[PDB]
Amino acid sequence: PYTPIDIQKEEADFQKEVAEIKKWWSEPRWRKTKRIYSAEDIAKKRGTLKINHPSSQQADKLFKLLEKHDADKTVSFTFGALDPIHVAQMAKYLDSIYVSGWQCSSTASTSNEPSPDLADYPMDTVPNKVEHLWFAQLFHDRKQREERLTLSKEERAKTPYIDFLRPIIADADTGHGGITAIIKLTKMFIERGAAGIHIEDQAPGTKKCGHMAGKVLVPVQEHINRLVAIRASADIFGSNLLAVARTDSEAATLITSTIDHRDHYFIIGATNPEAGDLAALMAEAESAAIESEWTKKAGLKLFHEAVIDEIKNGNYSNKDALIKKFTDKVNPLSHTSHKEAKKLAKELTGKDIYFNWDVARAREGYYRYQGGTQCAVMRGRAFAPYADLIWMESALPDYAQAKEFADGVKAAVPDQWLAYNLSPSFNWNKAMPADEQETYIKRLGKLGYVWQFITLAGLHTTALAVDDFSNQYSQIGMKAYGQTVQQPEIEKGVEVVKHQKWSGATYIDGLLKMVSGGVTSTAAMGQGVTEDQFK
Amino acid sequence: MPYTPIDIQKEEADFQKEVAEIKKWWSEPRWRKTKRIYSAEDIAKKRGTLKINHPSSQQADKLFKLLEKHDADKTVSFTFGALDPIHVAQMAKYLDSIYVSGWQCSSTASTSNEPSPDLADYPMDTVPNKVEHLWFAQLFHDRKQREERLTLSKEERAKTPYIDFLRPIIADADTGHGGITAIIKLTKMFIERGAAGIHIEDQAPGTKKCGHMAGKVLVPVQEHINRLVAIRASADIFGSNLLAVARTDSEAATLITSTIDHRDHYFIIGATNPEAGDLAALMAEAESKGIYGNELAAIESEWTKKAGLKLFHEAVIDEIKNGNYSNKDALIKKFTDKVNPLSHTSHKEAKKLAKELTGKDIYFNWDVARAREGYYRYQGGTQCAVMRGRAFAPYADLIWMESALPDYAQAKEFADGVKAAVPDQWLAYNLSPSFNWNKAMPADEQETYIKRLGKLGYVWQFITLAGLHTTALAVDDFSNQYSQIGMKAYGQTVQQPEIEKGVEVVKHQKWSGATYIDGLLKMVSGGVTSTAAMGQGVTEDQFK
Amino acid sequence: PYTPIDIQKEEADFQKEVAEIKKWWSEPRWRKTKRIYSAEDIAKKRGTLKINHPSSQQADKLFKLLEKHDADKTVSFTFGALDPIHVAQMAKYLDSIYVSGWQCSSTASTSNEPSPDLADYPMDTVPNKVEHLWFAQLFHDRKQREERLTLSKEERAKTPYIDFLRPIIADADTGHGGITAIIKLTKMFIERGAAGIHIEDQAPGTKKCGHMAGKVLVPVQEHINRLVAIRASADIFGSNLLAVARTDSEAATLITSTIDHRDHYFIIGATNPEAGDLAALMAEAESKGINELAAIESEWTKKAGLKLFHEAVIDEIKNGNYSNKDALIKKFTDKVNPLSHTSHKEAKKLAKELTGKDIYFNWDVARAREGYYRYQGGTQCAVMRGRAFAPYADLIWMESALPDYAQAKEFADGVKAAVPDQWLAYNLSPSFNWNKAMPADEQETYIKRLGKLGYVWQFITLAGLHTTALAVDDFSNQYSQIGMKAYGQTVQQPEIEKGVEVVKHQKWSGATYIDGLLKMVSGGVTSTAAMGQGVTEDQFK
Ligand SMILES: [Mg+2]
Numbered sequence A: 001p002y003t004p005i006d007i008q009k010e011e012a013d014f015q016k017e018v019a020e021i022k023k024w025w026s027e028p029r030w031r032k033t034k035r036i037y038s039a040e041d042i043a044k045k046r047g048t049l050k051i052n053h054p055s056s057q058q059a060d061k062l063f064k065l066l067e068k069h070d071a072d073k074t075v076s077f078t079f080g081a082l083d084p085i086h087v088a089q090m091a092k093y094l095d096s097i098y099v100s101g102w103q104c105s106s107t108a109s110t111s112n113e114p115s116p117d118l119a120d121y122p123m124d125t126v127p128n129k130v131e132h133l134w135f136a137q138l139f140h141d142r143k144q145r146e147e148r149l150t151l152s153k154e155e156r157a158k159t160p161y162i163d164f165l166r167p168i169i170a171d172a173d174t175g176h177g178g179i180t181a182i183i184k185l186t187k188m189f190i191e192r193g194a195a196g197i198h199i200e201d202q203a204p205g206t207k208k209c210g211h212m213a214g215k216v217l218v219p220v221q222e223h224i225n226r227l228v229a230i231r232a233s234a235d236i237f238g239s240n241l242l243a244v245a246r247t248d249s250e251a252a253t254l255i256t257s258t259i260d261h262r263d264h265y266f267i268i269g270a271t272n273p274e275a276g277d278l279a280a281l282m283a284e285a286e287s288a289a290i291e292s293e294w295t296k297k298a299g300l301k302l303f304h305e306a307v308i309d310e311i312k313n314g315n316y317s318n319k320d321a322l323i324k325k326f327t328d329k330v331n332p333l334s335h336t337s338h339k340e341a342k343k344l345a346k347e348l349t350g351k352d353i354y355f356n357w358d359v360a361r362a363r364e365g366y367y368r369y370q371g372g373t374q375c376a377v378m379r380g381r382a383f384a385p386y387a388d389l390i391w392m393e394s395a396l397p398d399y400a401q402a403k404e405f406a407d408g409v410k411a412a413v414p415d416q417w418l419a420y421n422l423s424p425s426f427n428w429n430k431a432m433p434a435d436e437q438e439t440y441i442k443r444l445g446k447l448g449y450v451w452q453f454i455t456l457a458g459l460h461t462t463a464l465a466v467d468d469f470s471n472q473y474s475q476i477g478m479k480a481y482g483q484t485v486q487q488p489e490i491e492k493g494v495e496v497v498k499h500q501k502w503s504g505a506t507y508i509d510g511l512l513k514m515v516s517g518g519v520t521s522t523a524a525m526g527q528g529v530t531e532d533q534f535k
Numbered sequence B: 001m002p003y004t005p006i007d008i009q010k011e012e013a014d015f016q017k018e019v020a021e022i023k024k025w026w027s028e029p030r031w032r033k034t035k036r037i038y039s040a041e042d043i044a045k046k047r048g049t050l051k052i053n054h055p056s057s058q059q060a061d062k063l064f065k066l067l068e069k070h071d072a073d074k075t076v077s078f079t080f081g082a083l084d085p086i087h088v089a090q091m092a093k094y095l096d097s098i099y100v101s102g103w104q105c106s107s108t109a110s111t112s113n114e115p116s117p118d119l120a121d122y123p124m125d126t127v128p129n130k131v132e133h134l135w136f137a138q139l140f141h142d143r144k145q146r147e148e149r150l151t152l153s154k155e156e157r158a159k160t161p162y163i164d165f166l167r168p169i170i171a172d173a174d175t176g177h178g179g180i181t182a183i184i185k186l187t188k189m190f191i192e193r194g195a196a197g198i199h200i201e202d203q204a205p206g207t208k209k210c211g212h213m214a215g216k217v218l219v220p221v222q223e224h225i226n227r228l229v230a231i232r233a234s235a236d237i238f239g240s241n242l243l244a245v246a247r248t249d250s251e252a253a254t255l256i257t258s259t260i261d262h263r264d265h266y267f268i269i270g271a272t273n274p275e276a277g278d279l280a281a282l283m284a285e286a287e288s289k290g291i292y293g294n295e296l297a298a299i300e301s302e303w304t305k306k307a308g309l310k311l312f313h314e315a316v317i318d319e320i321k322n323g324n325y326s327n328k329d330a331l332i333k334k335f336t337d338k339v340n341p342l343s344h345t346s347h348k349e350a351k352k353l354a355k356e357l358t359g360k361d362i363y364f365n366w367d368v369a370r371a372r373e374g375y376y377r378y379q380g381g382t383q384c385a386v387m388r389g390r391a392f393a394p395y396a397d398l399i400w401m402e403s404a405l406p407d408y409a410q411a412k413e414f415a416d417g418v419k420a421a422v423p424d425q426w427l428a429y430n431l432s433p434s435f436n437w438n439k440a441m442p443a444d445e446q447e448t449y450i451k452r453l454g455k456l457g458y459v460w461q462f463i464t465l466a467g468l469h470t471t472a473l474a475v476d477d478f479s480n481q482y483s484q485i486g487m488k489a490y491g492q493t494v495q496q497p498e499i500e501k502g503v504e505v506v507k508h509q510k511w512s513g514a515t516y517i518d519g520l521l522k523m524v525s526g527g528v529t530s531t532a533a534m535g536q537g538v539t540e541d542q543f544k
Numbered sequence C: 001p002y003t004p005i006d007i008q009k010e011e012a013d014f015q016k017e018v019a020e021i022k023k024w025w026s027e028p029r030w031r032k033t034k035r036i037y038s039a040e041d042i043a044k045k046r047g048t049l050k051i052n053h054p055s056s057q058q059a060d061k062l063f064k065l066l067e068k069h070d071a072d073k074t075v076s077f078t079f080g081a082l083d084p085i086h087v088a089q090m091a092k093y094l095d096s097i098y099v100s101g102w103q104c105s106s107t108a109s110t111s112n113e114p115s116p117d118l119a120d121y122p123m124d125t126v127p128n129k130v131e132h133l134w135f136a137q138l139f140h141d142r143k144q145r146e147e148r149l150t151l152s153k154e155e156r157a158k159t160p161y162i163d164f165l166r167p168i169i170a171d172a173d174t175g176h177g178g179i180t181a182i183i184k185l186t187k188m189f190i191e192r193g194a195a196g197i198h199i200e201d202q203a204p205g206t207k208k209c210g211h212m213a214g215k216v217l218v219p220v221q222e223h224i225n226r227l228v229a230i231r232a233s234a235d236i237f238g239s240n241l242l243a244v245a246r247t248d249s250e251a252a253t254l255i256t257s258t259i260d261h262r263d264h265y266f267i268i269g270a271t272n273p274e275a276g277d278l279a280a281l282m283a284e285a286e287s288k289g290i291n292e293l294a295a296i297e298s299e300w301t302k303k304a305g306l307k308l309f310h311e312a313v314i315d316e317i318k319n320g321n322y323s324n325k326d327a328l329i330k331k332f333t334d335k336v337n338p339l340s341h342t343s344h345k346e347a348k349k350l351a352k353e354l355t356g357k358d359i360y361f362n363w364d365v366a367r368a369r370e371g372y373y374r375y376q377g378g379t380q381c382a383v384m385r386g387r388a389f390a391p392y393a394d395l396i397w398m399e400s401a402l403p404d405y406a407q408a409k410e411f412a413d414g415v416k417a418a419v420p421d422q423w424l425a426y427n428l429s430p431s432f433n434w435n436k437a438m439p440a441d442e443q444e445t446y447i448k449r450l451g452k453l454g455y456v457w458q459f460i461t462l463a464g465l466h467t468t469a470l471a472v473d474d475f476s477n478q479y480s481q482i483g484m485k486a487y488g489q490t491v492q493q494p495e496i497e498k499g500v501e502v503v504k505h506q507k508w509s510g511a512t513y514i515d516g517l518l519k520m521v522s523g524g525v526t527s528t529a530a531m532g533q534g535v536t537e538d539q540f541k
């Protein structure tokens, strides 16, 4: 009625596996990777049947690729790919590939229902998009190998080689739920060909793009746990999957809890004892002008601003020197809890300086929050142990700020790889001249931004191209196609204009003949095909 | 308890009510030329207790009226193959219908994510899913735009231009992806997922080629008619005015699965030499003794010459020409006037006449010329295609002949040929990128080519693969620049051009429907919300 | 380059639609349904092309069905269906149908990756499961209509009728994210055949089954907004979709924020000023590499004196220098209680008036490490939340740890006191041991009895799972022991004797239906008929 098992061999295999994992973790890949669980803990989570996900090889390829870039102080630069066509053409020029959540929202949801970048498509949407590209890469790699190996050695060496298998880094948004969600999301990403995934310290289901407004953060620890959870998943299912940690704390103005000491410096509160709960005041009025009045009266600021203000406008003898006692101990990076910072302020001034961040809460319950670049450095440093790349969303393409953040992070973790969003949400001809544009990536490369991506480039290139042709098409008919697309395709290298070959027809005619004993009457690229018009 | 009771009288009453509703439906001007081989009774019996109205049907109506006006004005609804929501959103500005390509779906949109050349060997639901992809995008952007408009004043509305996102979609059904029951289910999906019209081809499934690949196998005329009937049956049951397009690949095809249909017989190639035996079996015997490769192809090329392959009428003409007959030119004409591409004369009948006219049983064997798979050999051209066009026309709102080149003469031949017998038949034309277009035509002719075909009655024309190629060019070009000149490439090649050409997407937060959703957010949160997506801070104030 | 439009006809059509919506909303269906937006607001959200989702007809069918049940004080009782087989057989006996999230987690995730009931499958999982059943219902309805209408009137009246089209109510869990998520989730449910969906006041990152532990709640308002969002979606895309509101506050011990005044009564805090932040104390002990840790918590908790603020006020008065104590509690309790919605500031203010202390109370310090606040719900908390949701919800539902009649009455009475016409729903959970919890005489009548209290819709959530699980395990066992005899004996004979339609499985699956479609298209006749001479179902006549 059941199956028997050798209990001794069980333990033996368990122990064997524990050791295999310990050896795995000791590899150079994990040199900077903090793990808070044991190899024992992980082995227990695995099954009796080992599975090897090819995605992991692309993780390795990605890591080595980034190693060399870091050493040479140069950049793996890429952008957001839409579809199999993109990755097939990109592979000629670029050495990694970005799958964008923003683009997936508009073009690739698994319910087919589009949206703005809110990560409210179904969870499997981006994982499915990776497989979309993954499998295309694999297919075109397979096609090209057949094309090559049916040539002579003499002919091979003439015909160029494309590396279709560029590693993919994919948007995991905020992880699409709790820890168990994130494990399952990571599992899918691994199964469907992800070399690396990135994940952001926003609250789920308030999730914004990045250069949208009203961004809510989560406690530092909560997002650490997310990164741990990714790693836990990758450890169980056995991928060297790269983890990227993103922070939206440059611009964010809200946060879900005050629970984490590291956040306290940045939590905004009311200095005026007389101010009551704004949330409840609005609720009673509703059952604006009253808000803008309450805010002025409430005197909102960060607690240290409040301490400095007390000392500045106070009966204190040696004021400049007394700020510095406080600021040297209490600052963005200093991780000083609020109780602790109040205690010091009392020692230095003799007041319990009043501060209430409960009353400034939004109606949803979020606490108010003043991040900038230094907050982002704080969170960068915190994530760094858990994350192979670190990434700070910025409202502009500002070199100074990028340096501030890079310097800030590397001061505490000098070997940390950084990543930068080259966002089309910026107007790029407004933000800098073209001479600077050309060198901007390179310059950030020096600061240690080893991976950079234009998130929405695939969207926009396609959008321009289709709108432009549609316009021509409407005006001058088939001349538009000859002129705007097909001639240009021939004159530039573009492989797709011979689209039967590109799509893998001669590859499949191979499979057809092979199965039919060498010969077949229904050959797809035999005499008659209309691609002899492209010779 | 154990079951549910029903009024048997109300049942019959509702049945009869529905039968009448269907009869009234079928009598509408839409179906004026639409042959149906079943009764309204037959269809009503197939329906359920719960009526469902698929919005796709409204787009069918929109498509039919749109094509009516084009036919009347002798002008063209011209479009191309859309890839994704971005395409349809931008296309809607300029074009009035939309093509979903099976070829493109094979490479970019299979539901198994496994790409291919155009063999229709992705899973059946692949193109139906692609339509819904675009359908739902159309619906979404229509919804977005209506909110944008209706939160403006009447004064402001009238300044801001309107896009009709809801352009009717015509989608590739390949060869129907199996039998009759398959085709019903495939059509059902297309209707449910937003298809205004679908097209379907007289090739055999699972030998299915692109139109401009080689080794194309046809099916009997009747078999493909049954396919079209099956589409109509499905659309009738589930209640769509779905347009049906019939395609024939018989211009170029050289094979066919059966000889069963008398209409095909004229075109079936056979051996005139009694001495020639079964080629198929001869090859098999040579292969089993380990003759392979080019020495084997020698045996075929020898057998073919010896076998004297031709069409039976060529054989009759040949007998008379090289024969002891007095009045030869006049004797061919007796035969050709009775027996020709359009004449539907069976082989038995054509042999009988040849015997009357010559006194021979002229030898003809098309079994021996069969391919190893069992297909019969077949010599179509434009006239064969006209034959099949005419046959399909009763069952098909548009008719479509795949061509190896963009040849005006041939297009006229086919149009004239079909309209002679069915003068009110709408035609459709593939403006294929499988043609080299600067090799085939000068540019002056290019500009007017669509218009000229419009005169002949090609009311719907499409570039099948244009979406593929525009995207392919664009991404390759930018990737190249990007690799050479960094972020300057984006400023220069994409984003500036986007601003200058007025392309809506460069403001991509708005385009994607952020302000639309902020609407929904505030509305639900009682007017106000702290997490507004397009509030103060959004970086699209850099595009004002 | 664009399309022109009549600006006047635009406004006219807009206004036309606004009116159509206003008329729609005034129908008897919406008699108890609070809306916080205007018909103007909704019309603006719609597109130029109206779409009619058949699911909405099943919503109507469900509402009328429940109306009659409420009036007759009887119950629409059902359970959790797995697959097309279930709905096809259920339709004979039952009048509605439940699609379970729990079951979907184990059997029907769209990633095919199973799990316990954590709602961490992809969002479209349950919506897809409804369509699974929806389309089966529609198919078998279509099959049966053909079977009937190819009989004579004489023969029809002999052969029984099955109503396959039983309305479906489906698990939306906690909505699978924010407001925009919930709209999109509802849209899918409508498109895929949902008559009604239910939704729970748990946090999404932490979603438990109803009878798992460690349940985190969200603020009352937050879950109201969820229900509003469902309604907003249904209004835009034009369904009379029923909304069910669930509360897990009977058993839950945690909550994400204190922001909502209604919750304050129930938020647990420390009465001892000396107790510091438990969260941070644990963190400091853990970072030095400390069951010995759980010792530090259990010590801190005893020392901290955790309770609800009113317990703290009552305790002060009881053990205090006060003259008229019983009477002084009642001054507080009459003003401050589970249903009274009294904020904490307000309740402290009153306690000061009544005792002259600022009675110390700190609920920040008792927070879990994740940041959740501690929370003591029971049935009265659930009534509080029931009442709050009722305006927004066609049915109200309180998860319970046992099948206790008294508790069910407490909750029903409690809710109906303030909203007497509110329909209620009850989980008849297999998470209960049912032969341990009551005798069989009571079992038989338990549904009926709850029907009296106004529980008009009741469901066994996991019954489909368990019936199947028993059946397959039992047969597999027999099969393994006595071969094909097991099938003759355990399944196929019983199928014949019990009249189960599926044993003639070719007919049941709709073969004769499709042969119809085949012949019809082929001009009346076809050589490849599936149920022609040769089919081996003449062995079942
Ligand atoms: Mg993104």
Ligand SMILES: [Mg+2]
Pocket (backbone or CB within 6 Å): B101, B102, B103, B104, B118, B172, B464
């Ligand atoms: Mg195609």
Ligand SMILES: [Mg+2]
Pocket (backbone or CB within 6 Å): C100, C101, C102, C103, C117, C171, C209
């Ligand atoms: Mg459930």
